[PDB]
Amino acid sequence: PVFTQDVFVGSVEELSAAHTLVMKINATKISYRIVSLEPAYPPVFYLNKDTGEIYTTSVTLDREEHSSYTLTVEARDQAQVQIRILDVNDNIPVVELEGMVEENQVNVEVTRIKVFDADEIGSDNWLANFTFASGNEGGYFHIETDAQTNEGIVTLIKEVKNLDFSVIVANKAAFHKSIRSKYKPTPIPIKVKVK
Amino acid sequence: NNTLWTGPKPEANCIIEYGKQNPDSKLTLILVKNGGIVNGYVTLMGASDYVNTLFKNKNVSINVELYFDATGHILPDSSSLKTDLELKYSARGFMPSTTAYPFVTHNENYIFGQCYYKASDGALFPLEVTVMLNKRLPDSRTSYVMTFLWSLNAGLAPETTQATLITSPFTFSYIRED
Amino acid sequence: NNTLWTGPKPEANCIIEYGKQNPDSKLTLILVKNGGIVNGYVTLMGASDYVNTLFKNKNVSINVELYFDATGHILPDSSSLKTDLELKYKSARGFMPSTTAYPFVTHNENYIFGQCYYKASDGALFPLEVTVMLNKRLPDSRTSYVMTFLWSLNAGLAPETTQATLITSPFTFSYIRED
Amino acid sequence: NNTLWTGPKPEANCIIEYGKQNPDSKLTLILVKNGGIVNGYVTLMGASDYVNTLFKNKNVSINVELYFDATGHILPDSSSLKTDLELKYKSARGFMPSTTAYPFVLPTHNENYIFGQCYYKASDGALFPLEVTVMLNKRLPDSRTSYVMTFLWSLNAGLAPETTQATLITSPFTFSYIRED
């Protein structure tokens, strides 16, 4: 029959376990039934037809493949359900180099380390946290993630030869429990050029 | 009397389509008494369209749960199997150990491993097997819990057409309860 | 009695090279009966020059086939093992792979996969992908059970540069026995 | 009599951190006399602080040495498992690894290694894979032992599996070897 609301808003996390509860729809016997899905090539969700609890199924979700879903349910003796997928950090950052500095110039930018993550743009799961591997023993370069364009800015602190170094890329948040223990730090080297 | 059969080539006795009343997939479960431990043998064959079109996706987790009682027979209304296990010629000796795999993190109740799924063209895509013993009581008449999980992740799908889901045989060992 | 030895430390009885008639490798195969299934043990050891220079390459294949008969004895004129499997203390049909669970012909329910490790002479460790294929095929009309093996390798760098004795780690499997 | 226990869930009996009196880690070892082979079972569990802080690093290696004698008992003087193994329904030569297939050498020898893998579930659920190297006899340490069976859980990861302290529990590893008659 007629529902108690107009548009159901729910959420579910990416790469969750099977038969995880997404949301619970209700109405004023009552037979809940999904009659349409707008993305329909996997059956990703499962509506419990007796009580109306949307469960996930044996094929798990993917935010990076499809950002959100929309399915219209029907109660027999209709309403939209908009399910937005919560992003987790299941994607390792990769780096797609030279630098030219002058003699004894303080706080001059060197170059921009480009980095291309594939998670949600603007969170901690896409912002690349740059650390050091070898080359900042004497305290020379400070590193920074520019949050608008995702670039590893390097800039002189103690001004000053081919003093090369290497960075290690990671995200600002922790990696997901299916992708951690597969990540290995690859030291990406950078040659500087003084004059 | 030291083998719990399902049959070497059985009919359909498991349900993976969550919300379907008939059995639609076959699994062979053979548990033999070997001294103080019990050797394991499990594989899963699909017998419907929904199970055979599971592996057109990249991330698929298949779940099978078994809920034995205190005697040793499968409760056929809550577990994922629909036909209880039979001997070769009660069945408390094949059940897992209560004092070694106890009820409540508790990472001591787990047995991990690996099997393989050979595709329709042949690529040897590996599946990660997670066998979880007791750890959880669903009601007041269940007393022993066994739970399998075949978790696959891949960069691309194993097939683009429906053929047949057949996993490789998996071997495990757990402490039994006398 | 519930054991089919080859031996605890066997002599050269298995051939590898397509064209040779002399045995040039040792195959330690132990099958024991355990209830309704049969466990396993396999370890190939090199005993020539050609098996020892196999691992100079980066992609190899070591094919070992065992064509049984209707009683349980290895036919030595068509298999790759020139020595019959003899028991421990004292009809060996109860050790064979079953023809009901592993039938004759598709049919990917006959394979048993796994992994053993080759330890190189310089200290490194290399994994080998074992493929054990049960019946699936009849090479003749006298054969009634087939049990083959394959030790594949696909590594980037070569494991050895010179001749070293090829020993693989033990591999353990299980299958359903014929009643 | 075909089971060699250590207990289904024992107390702290093993010793890691060389140069220590009291035991600091549990160890479950079940050897079953199955025909012509022995079906094994091994599982570590931490019972102190030093074994629990092991996975703060990424390149660690846990080593357990067992030194049997000619009648088939663990010498509690120079081994690591400071507890004699029992039976299920209490000689124990029939579970020991055979010197025909795995013999001693004295100068290389690589035919008495059993390589395998177990897994470590971390504090957040990430499975870290450990390498197990079971080494049968190969090396007589002194003049009293007769059989040597050592284990080695090794880890070489890219990140630390822990930062705080948690119970180091490893997965049940199942091996097989040829037994002494």
Residue numbers in the entry:
A (entry chain D): 108 to 135, 146 to 194, 206 to 224, 228 to 291, 297 to 331
B (entry chain A): 130 to 218, 225 to 239, 245 to 318
C (entry chain C): 130 to 219, 225 to 239, 245 to 318
D (entry chain B): 130 to 219, 225 to 241, 245 to 318
Question: Paper's wording?
Answer:
The first step of adenoviral replication involves the interaction of the fibre protein and more precisely the globular trimeric knob with an attachment receptor from the host cell. Desmoglein 2 (DSG2), a newly identified adenovirus receptor has been reported to be used by some species B human adenoviruses including HAd3, HAd7, HAd11 and HAd14 for cell infection. The intermediate portion of the DSG2 ectodomain, consisting of EC2 and EC3, has been described as important for recognition by the HAd3 knob (HAd3K), the trimeric globular distal part of the fibre protein. Here, we report the structure of HAd3 fibre knob (HAd3K) in complex with one and two molecules of the DSG2 receptor.
We recently demonstrated that HAd3K binds to DSG2 by a non-classical mechanism involving mainly one receptor bound per trimeric fibre knob. The interaction with DSG2 ectodomains (EC2 and EC3) takes place at the top of the trimeric HAd3K close to the three-fold axis. The EC2-EC3 domains span two HAd3K monomers, with the third monomer having no contacts with the receptor in the 1:1 complex. Each EC domain interacts with one monomer and targets primarily loop regions of HAd3K. In monomer ‘A’, the EC2 domain interacts with a surface exposed loop between the A and B strands and the C–D loop and N-terminal portion of the D strand. EC3 interacts with a loop between the G–H strands of monomer ‘B’. Several residues distributed along the EC2 primary sequence were found to interact with the HAd3K monomer, while only one region in EC3 (covering residues 311 to 321) is involved in the interaction with the groove of a second monomer. In the 1:1 HAd3K-DSG structure only a single monomer of HAd3K binds either the EC2 or EC3 domains. N186, V189 and S190 are at the interface between HAd3K and the EC2 module while L296, D261 or F265 are part of the HAd3K/EC3 module interface. Modeling of HAd3K binding to one DSG2 molecule in such an organized structure precludes the binding of a second DSG2 molecule coming either in cis or in trans without significant rearrangement of the desmosomal cadherins.
